Structures are given as C-alpha cells and as structure tokens.
Design a protein around this ligand. Sequence first.
Ligand SMILES: OC[C@H]1O[C@@H](SCCc2ccccc2)[C@H](O)[C@@H](O)[C@H]1O
Ligand SMILES: [Mg+2]
Lengths: 208, 1014
Amino acid sequence: YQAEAALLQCTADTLADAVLITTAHAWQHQGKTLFISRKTYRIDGSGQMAITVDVEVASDTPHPARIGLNCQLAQVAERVNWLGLGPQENYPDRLTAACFDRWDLPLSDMYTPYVFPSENGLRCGTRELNYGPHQWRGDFQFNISRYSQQQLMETSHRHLLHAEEGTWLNIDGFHMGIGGDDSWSPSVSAEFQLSAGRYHYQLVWCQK
Amino acid sequence: VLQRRDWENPGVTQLNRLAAHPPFASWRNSEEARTDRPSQQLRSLNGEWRFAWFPAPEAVPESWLECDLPEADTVVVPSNWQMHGYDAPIYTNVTYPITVNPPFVPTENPTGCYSLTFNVDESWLQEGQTRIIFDGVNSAFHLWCNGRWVGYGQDSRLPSEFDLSAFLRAGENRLAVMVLRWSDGSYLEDQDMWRMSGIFRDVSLLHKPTTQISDFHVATRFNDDFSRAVLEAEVQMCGELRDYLRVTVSLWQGETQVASGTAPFGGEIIDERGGYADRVTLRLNVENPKLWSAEIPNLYRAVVELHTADGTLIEAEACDVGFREVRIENGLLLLNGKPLLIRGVNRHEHHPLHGQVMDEQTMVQDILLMKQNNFNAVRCSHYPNHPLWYTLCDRYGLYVVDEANIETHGMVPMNRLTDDPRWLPAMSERVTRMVQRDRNHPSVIIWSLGNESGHGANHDALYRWIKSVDPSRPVQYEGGGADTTATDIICPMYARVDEDQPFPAVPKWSIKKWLSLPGETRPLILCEYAHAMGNSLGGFAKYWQAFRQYPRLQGGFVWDWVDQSLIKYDENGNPWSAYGGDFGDTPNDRQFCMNGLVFADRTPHPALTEAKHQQQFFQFRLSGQTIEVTSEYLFRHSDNELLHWMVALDGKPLASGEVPLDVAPQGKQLIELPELPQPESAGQLWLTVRVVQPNATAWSEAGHISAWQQWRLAENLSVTLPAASHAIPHLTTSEMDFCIELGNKRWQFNRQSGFLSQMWIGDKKQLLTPLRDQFTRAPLDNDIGVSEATRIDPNAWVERWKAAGHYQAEAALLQCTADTLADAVLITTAHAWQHQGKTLFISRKTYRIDGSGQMAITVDVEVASDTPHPARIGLNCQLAQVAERVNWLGLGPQENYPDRLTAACFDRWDLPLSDMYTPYVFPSENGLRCGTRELNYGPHQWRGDFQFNISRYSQQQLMETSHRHLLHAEEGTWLNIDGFHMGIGGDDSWSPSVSAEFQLSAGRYHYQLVWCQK
Ligand SMILES: OC[C@H]1O[C@@H](SCCc2ccccc2)[C@H](O)[C@@H](O)[C@H]1O
Ligand SMILES: [Mg+2]
C-alpha cells in the first residue's frame, strides 16, 4: 500500500509512421524491490495508442491482489458499453454464471453497494470497453466508478461515500480470486493467486 | 501317444506327474541343512543336450526314442529355441498368436526334441526313490527314459516331477523330451510378452529315501504387541510308518539355536474316522522374535529332521522363516500391525540375449536397482517366477505378489473360458500348485488369481479355495471390474486420480471416488498404473500426492520394470534393439513390448529418477529457517542417514553444512539452519537438502543419496540498467534483405520469408537453417496410442494434429519492417500459418539489436480456439557448429517435461552433447530441459525463461525413423527453444491422457529471449 515508484528509464523515438515511448519503474519499500514494470507506448497515424506492459514480481513478496493500470478520467458519462462477461459483477473464481456478449448499463449499475465498502464491480474476460468518446481494446478485466480504491479502503459504511470529480477507471491484466470457503482464514485457492513471477498484457486506447 | 493328442484336451493336464511341494534338497546331514550347503542328493542336468526341430509332432521319426538322430545339434539347456534361430519369436499383446478355436491348436505345431545321455551312480539304484524335476517347459511335453514312456505335463511356469526309479539302469541312461509350442494350455497363457518355447528353466535329479518328508508348512502367530510368537510346523511323511520314527523341528538365528521340538507321528482327531497317522504338528514358542519386513529383513532358519528314536538321521529339509503378520483390518492392509504404503513395480522375466531364461546375476542386479530407487514391492507379472527369486526377495527385503499362470485376454467375451465348468480343472491346477510350492516364503504377502480373464464362477471357487487352505495372506484379482467378490483389495488397472472413465459393465472410477462408493470398505492398491512406454510418467506426482493424503489408498505397482526388446545383428555384425514385427512375426503389436523404467540391458530411462523422488521415505517442509523432516519408515529408526544442505545464488554456492538425522519411525525432526548469508547481488537464492547414507548396506554403496528436495528463498530483482554503449548498429536495406552490422558481427533478415536467415561472427556463417517458429513435436508413444496406417484412431493427439494440418501448415508473410532508433535497430515481423484457408496460428515478433551486440527477441502468438491445442510454441534453427559441452542454468541434470519435473533441481549443469539426447528405441521428441534461464553452447548464449532441447537429429528425422539404430547425425546442431511445451501424459498409452492444466489452451502466448555472443 506504501510502495513508491522510482523511474529507471524514459526515452522517445520517431519511427517511420509512429512515435515510441519506452519507460521502466521500480516499486520499493525500505530498500526491497517489490515490482518492476517495463512499458512501451506506440502512437500511430490512425491516432491509436498501443500499450505493452511487462511486470516482474519478487518471489518472496506476498502475491499481489492485481496487476493493472488506473486513472481518473475528467468526464462523466451515463452509460458503459462492453464486450465481455456480464452483465453482473464477476471475478476470476466467480464467473461461471456470467456470459460473453455485448452489455450496456447505466454507470450506477457498475457499482455494487456493499454495506461495508470494498473492491467491487469488476468484469472479467473483456475484449472492448466504450465510455464517452474513449474505447479500450485487449483481453482484460476492468471496473469503472466514481469512488477511488483509496476512498473505498478508508470508509467503513456505504452511506459515508461521496462521488469524486470524474470517473475512476481500473484496467487489469490479472486479478486475484476473492475466496469465500470461510472469512476468518485465507481461502483463495493456489490456481487463483498471482504467483507466476512474470506477467505480460497489452491494451489499445483509441477515440471512437 | 500320437492317437490320444493330450495337448488338445483341457481335461488332461498331466499324466504320472508327482504332487507339488516346497523346494527340497534331501540333505543327509543336519549341519549341511542348517548352513544351506549344496546337497549331494540334488544333481543339476543343465549343460549340453542334443536338439532337433520339427514342423509338427507327426514328423518326429520313431528311431529318436531309441538313439540320437545324426542331424541333431548340441545346445545349452536351459534355453528358448527361438533364441537359437530355429523359428521366429512372436510379439502379440491381446490377439492370440493362433486361430481361436478352443481346445484345438494348429496342425503345424513346431516341436522341439531334446535328449541327454547321463551316468547314474550305483548307490542311487539300490535304495530309495530317484525323481527328475523340470522347473519350466513351454508349453507341453512328453518324456521317455531309455525308450519307455514316463509321463506328460502342461503349465509352463511351475515345476513338473516324475519318478524314474523303475526306468533307470546302472551305466549310461538316455532321456528324450518332446516339447510342443502350442497346447490347450496356450489358451490360458495369453500374457502380453514374447511368445517363445523350450526347456527354459533348470533340470535336476533328486534322490530321496523310501521313508521321506513329503511336505511341510510353517505358520507364525503373535500376541497383540508382537512380543511372543508361536511357530507351528506341520510335517507329512510317505513310506512305511514305524513306531520308532520321530520328527524334530529346530529354529536357528545365525549359529544360536532359539527353539526346538520333537514328536512321533500321529495328528489330533479331525473327524468321526480319526486323524492323520502320517502327519505331526510341532509348536515352538519364541520370545521377542525379530520381525521380518522390507525395511529390516530379519530371517531365521528352520531345520526339519526325520530320524529314529535312537537318534539315526534319515533325511533333513530346511527353509528360511520370517516372522510377520499380514491382515486386512477396518479397510487397511496391515503388516506387523502398521499400514503399508506399496512402492511397487510389475516385473517380467526377460533378458535381451537369452529371452525368458533367468540367471542369478540378472536377478540380483534387478533387486539392487529396485531398492536403490526406493521400490519396496514387486508383482510377478503374470505367472510364478523362478524359485530363486523368492529367496532373494526374503533376504534383501521386497514384498511379493505371487500370481497364478492364467490369462485369457484374447477371448470374446473375456470370461468365455473362466465361466465354463469344463475349464475349472485346468485353472485349479494353476492356482493350487502355485500355493503348495510358495506358501513358506515370508516375502510373499498377497496371492493373485491371474490377470485379465473377466469374472467367472471359476474365479470365485478358487478365491474361496485359497482362503481356506492359507488364511494368512489376502487374495487379489483385477478381472471383471477390479472390485468383484473374488478380491480382498480393490485393484484397478490405470484408474486415474481425478477423472472417471465410465465404460459399460466395467467402469474405471477415479481412485478417490472409488473408495467412497455406497457399501465399499476394502483398501485400494492399483495392480498397474503409470504406463511407462517411451517418454512417459507425466502426472506421476499426482498419484503420490493422493496416496499420502488418503489412508485407504495404499499405493500401487508401476507398469513396468524392464523393456522387452530383443537383440538382432546387422550386416557388419553390430547389435541393435528390436521389437514386435522385427522377426517377420505377423500380426504383431510393434513397440508395445517396451514399457520399462530401464532399458533391456538395465540402464535407466529418465523416468526412473521421477519414480525415485516421488517414492522417497523422507518428506520435508520449510518454515522460515526451520526444516521439518518426517520419516515414512514403519519399523526402522534412521541410523544410517546424514542431512546435507546447500544455499546457492543462481548456481554459485554460498553456504553448506551437514546434520545427522535422528527420527523415529513415522516421527518428525526439526532442523534449524544457521543465519543464512544476505548477498547484495541480484538473483534468486535456492536451498537444496539431500539425505545421504554414509555406510554401505547389502543393497547400496557408501554415499548413496536416498531423498532430496529444493525451495526458493529470498530474491533480489535487478534494478540496474545495461551499460550505455558508444557504438550504434548500422542498417543496410536492399530489395532482398535487411542487413545489420556492428563490429565484426552481421545479421541478415530475408524480406520474402521474414526470418533471420544468417548471422556472421567475422567471416564464419553461424546458421545452416533460418530461425523459424515451430508448433509441432516428433510424436511420443503416448501421442500415437494404438493409431496405425491401416486402422486410424481419430481420438489420438497425433491424428488430431495431422487432420488439422499442424505438420503441413505454411507460413505466409503479413509484415516485415525495419527502423533505426537512437542506439538500436528494430525489425518487426508478422506471419500467419494456414491450412486450406483456415488460419491456425499468428506470430508477431520484434528483434532489437543494440550497441552491446545483443539481440532481444519478443514473440506474441495467437492460436485459433477450435484447432487442437499445439504441442509447443517456440523457435528452431540448425546451428553451423558442433561443440563438445552444453552448459545451462535451469532444471537438471536429466531430461524433464512440464508434467514430469519434480525430481529435477535448479542449478548450473554441464554435460557432453550426447547426454542431451535420450536414445529411446522408438525415436521421438526427447531431451527437453525446463525452467531454464541461461544456455551456453559454443560462442552463443541465450537468456530468458524457456525450455530447450539440443541435438544432432531434426524433429523431421525423429518422426520418419522407426528404430534408434537407423538415425544419422545431421550437419551442425538442431536447437529448439520453447516458450511453452505441452505435457507428455502416461496414465495409459492407448487413450489421450495429458491433463487439462498441461495443455496449451490459453489462446494467447508471449515469451522473450536474448541471443548474444559470450
Ligand atoms: O503394454 C500394453 C498394455 O495394454 C493394455 S490393453 C490396451 C492397449 C493395447 C491393446 C492392443 C494392442 C496394443 C495395446 C493392458 O491392459 C496392459 O496390461 C498392458 O499389457
Ligand atoms: Mg493382457
């Protein structure tokens, strides 16, 4: 929760028909490196931005809850449209009931109002997501809402949450299971833990 | 004799054959019996005999009974006559090698005529009884002595004895033996093995006195905690009963007499008519007996003496006694009150030069290798063994399942003969004579009614016969669905751990589910599992996890110990390994005769090390700095055991140490490690522990490793940049090629194919073939199954890959571009693999060549969801150079695959190029190493996270060649580097058996390599 990103590399290059940005970051806590991410951004003449991500996780840190990107978008739209598992909230070890199709819901149905606030509203197996003028394409899991992960963690009751300016988007290449064999001891099975040490995913961000 | 045709009549299995009994030597001195010295009363007739071969028994001339044929050769006995070139051995699995028409056999019935001239001593003919013993003859035979007919025998795997007292004369005597290849007994001997014939075990003469010991049985009973035993010995005599006759039984431990008893003949009253006048039962008390087990094979020696009341010895007999108790209680098989875990293997009697002739030296070699690989049990598949085998298992310590010679696999339905009462006589001789021969051996713990003969009323009758004559051992039988009323143990073959196979009438449930079916209470021990054919034993760890977690899963017997290949010679007289069909035998079952963990010359396959590790007797757990050691021994303390530990950072040793093990049977020991070093340098730290035996044993050398395990400790990720180079690579663009130069190095990319087509260091070309994607492997035996060109099996992996076009698919270029960055050159390619308009795979690659001279390759592959999952996703090329050594940092040192890699350890390994090839007799994909981070070969170095194989043989040549002796080294070296590789399977080899977690089914894959010159 406390680890600070330190820049290792940030370079730019003009190719024939595109611009390529390359970055690398290390996340540290008291001298220990927890994660490294290496990214390329390729912006071509069609106006698409292709993002490639490669992450390494130290074998002796506890497996992380997710590996993804987040940002706060400036705009609020009424509807979310996606091609992926739906229509309800689904997670990697609770997604048999969800079906793959084109789904379309108001932004408020993308938030599950649990009385004790937590991570909520994820959709898995997603190939395309549309929100306002933006479109993301890939093979990912996402959640979209007016509440940051920080605000959900600090607030003990759903009536004390307030909508933030704009919309918080989380796009994950990988997400850990939620468990539930019991709630008083670790219960996420070994096949749902992010224990592989190296991960790779890719996204295209465009304006359609 | 030619008009009765006894070999075509299941009602006649013998004429004039003597009763079965335990092994006898007829000593005439009690000390010679006690110390097991050779007996003058037992002569071997093994050596040179005369032999003639005939196409049928009607072709044997009548003069052969009186005198030697001039056209006979001299041959060694024991032998199989197919091993001397007289006719071809036949390898068939299920189909009978003759027309199925019981009880008739072909009129063309190859016949072997053996003869021997021999002297008999004068002293042998004045007094007593002379008998001849044939330990095994295949398949039926008639015997003559000095021209006169003596008798007839069938059942190839148990001894046949005949009285020769009335036929022998002083001086020169002649035996004549006529052996038939086929008989009605052949219908009950359809085991999966080479079909051979001849006098293939020992021949001997035994002299007994007229008043003699004719049988004896030994039984042991215990109190609740095994602190007091009663040895009960029943002795029977033949000949004239006299009042002065006495029997003494004594029990020896080494040179110390421990117990003794003496009685006159006359048993207790049995029924309204009295008792046995010609039997006696002695009871001997033994306090604190040393118990026999496979861990500690403590033996006593029992001597039985027939003597007169005034003390004159008539004859002595002896055997080894082991005190142990085997019972089933509350659904568990117990030995000496503790539950067994069977580390078993199936073993055939097979030698590559001598066929089915077993010698002592071969038997001892098999037993030492078994114990050295953590096996404790052996199944006699599928017939009684040579009598010396049970003696060696008693002395060294292996549990034995002894099996009757009955298998009728090729019948339709499988129980056609075993449900018929006309075959009940023939089957009962095979079961009752085995029990009368072997019931005194401590190593025999379970009887088996035979193999693969369905379930018939004859099996129930014989199950109940054994329970009544020998209540001290359980009975098992697998036929008719493995859990019938004719078995004490559920004993399936090839049931899977988690997956059901619901066949009609005879389903194979998953073993965990079978245990809990409504009503079921018996223990479960697999009589055959993990078919080891070729490159196999994938998923072996999954059986051993289940065996340790479930009490009623008590282990199993691997199929099987040794490959049944034979030796043939080429034109230059060089030996090669041959299999079904290589002798002109037809029909045949080709390479299905090679299922062993060892090659026929007793050299190990790579799967042997996976078996050794899963079967270890010590289990380990790591918690912080503490190792917890658990013993899985039932009876011994760890008194010959030292734990070595070593910590290494990416192959480099940092700390080491030893600790003595002191752990009680089924106990635990905690070992605390010293404060481990904290290095600053990047990389993963690894801890390896190994259990070493400092002293030699009967079965192992000083320094033998019996158990090991490896864990990851702390990791430090590398956060330093590559050193900024001054030089920039130069790009030259022609119409045909992109060419990149830096210093003396040069790379060339072909613009029509889109592959790296050549690389130079100085002026020396490095490649003979372009670096290309590869999605296929030379198919393993488990990929092919029972599929053949005549009869295609559409469900096998090789058939799915062929029908879909994976072997034929052509790469089509979609894109090939080049760009100069600031400090590097970047090449981008894309290819599609097609077959008849369908796209199977797409690969997108980037090559980045920087100023340090490194080439970084990124690969992204898509696989169509409806094509069968590919065997691998990787690159291949043929390098121009041949080097002596391969050095790698990864799992090793032996061949390992994604579902067979628990036994391999991560370290720095270094081997000659030839150890990177596994010479399976049927060629296939082989030699892979997984989990690899760095590979060095000549001047080249590859870095990444990959699996590789390196050799002189292409995947194409391995797929097209049927025998390892026909392979030839290609120019240069074939390298395969895979991001991903499918599992090898091996639950069985005749249906798909690669588990879902080992299939490449994710649709999208990514991997990266760096290729440099260090
Ligand atoms: O080593 C082969 C194995 O074959 C299978 S039959 C099914 C496979 C098969 C059938 C016919 C020809 C070849 C293989 C047996 O059940 C095993 O005991 C073992 O003998
Ligand atoms: Mg069979």
